Amino acid sequence: DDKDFLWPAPNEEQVTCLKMYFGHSSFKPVQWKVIHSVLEERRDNVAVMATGYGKSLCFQYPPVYVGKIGLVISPLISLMEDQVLQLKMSNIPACFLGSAQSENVLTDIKLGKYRIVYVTPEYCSGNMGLLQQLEADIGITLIAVDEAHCISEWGHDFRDSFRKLGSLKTALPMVPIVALTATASSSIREDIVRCLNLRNPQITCTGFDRPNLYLEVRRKTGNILQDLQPFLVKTSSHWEFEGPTIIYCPSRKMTQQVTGELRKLNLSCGTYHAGMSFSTRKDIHHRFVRDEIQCVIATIAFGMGINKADIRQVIHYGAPKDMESYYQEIGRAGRDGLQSSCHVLWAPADINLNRHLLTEIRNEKFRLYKLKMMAKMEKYLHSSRCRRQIILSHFEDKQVQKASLGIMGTEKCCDNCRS
């Protein structure tokens, strides 16, 4: 069951609703992330998606489940017409709202007869008073802004119509905005978050097969220098990795240890852990971005703000917490699209493997969730199957494995695909 690997667990009516109106068994981790953060946290989202495969459910499902109203703001007229028809045929009442259509649909929208209203950014700019009325009389579950990259002057597909969608948060500060786009440009999403005036936005990135990441799992011995020696190359007196390198460790003690023995070879490296000031941390980034230091030995803490294109190696010195955290950590590697490697070095005596450590948690539901996650991360590490296939299976939809051409099976895919 996939529903086991979601936190919170989608309730029984949520599952019923998905099968009834969309015809699916379970939510994928990213879909659930976006949907739940909309419904329960009312949190602005930026959803990066390489295709429209599982893209619609993110903004269509929420207003259907609560039975209120969702607003999709898009310039893609014919794509909007196809989705309006698909919703109508799935017994979801939906319309295209524009100046031409207004006389037939507007009264019905105002009296709450539509779950999902598609509009152009042109039309939306004029009728902010209509939006405030709908918030007041029904309540708007969310506003989806598709092709959100069109708000950016520095993007490749700029649209004048998008300029005044900034006023949505001024007009509706309580209503969450789901900004959708097909570009993984870090500068454009900063334009999207800025121009749409988004607050503490959840960022997600799916539909990409990351063919330039090689995955390996490898038994850890005990001796640190023994374990890392394979990854090291000397140039004169000092030692160095082949490129920019991140070594995530499960404990704060380990980051100090690993950094300790890596220093003895005069390696250009530094720590980044929980128990320190958000001041020394600021420089380590700027050093690492400017290639002043080569390696960073960190915990789960380091990563969220990393925009470094040329990360060549990620190493998990010890089994990671779970697949969620692992997916995030490896996802930072090789953003430039050049060959990078992601190695796990694990032993059975790692703190994220012992089950009789989580028995301390007395909340039944949460304890069972953490055990399913530990079991599944364990199943991945011991696997003799394709590391990429396990990860795509769990995180991405079926059509990302199908669309994944000419990497799975090759000597650059994973240790299991090699031998």
Ligand SMILES: O=C(Cn1c2c(c(=O)n3nc(N4CCOCC4)nc13)C1(CCN(C(=O)Cc3nc4ccccc4o3)CC1)OC2)Nc1ccc(C(F)(F)F)cc1Cl
């Ligand atoms: O790689 C991806 C998707 N993807 C992800 C991230 C990312 O950066 N990129 N970057 C890409 N590229 C797509 C292709 O073009 C280059 C960039 N893809 C992803 C992140 C996003 C979330 N994140 C955070 O720390 C939060 C956060 N980020 C922020 C950025 C700015 C500001 C605030 C932020 O807050 C961790 C990194 O995780 C997913 N999928 C994937 C596909 C196949 C395989 C396989 F090979 F194993 F099979 C493994 C994986 Cl992981």
Ligand SMILES: [Zn+2]
């Ligand atoms: Zn493989």
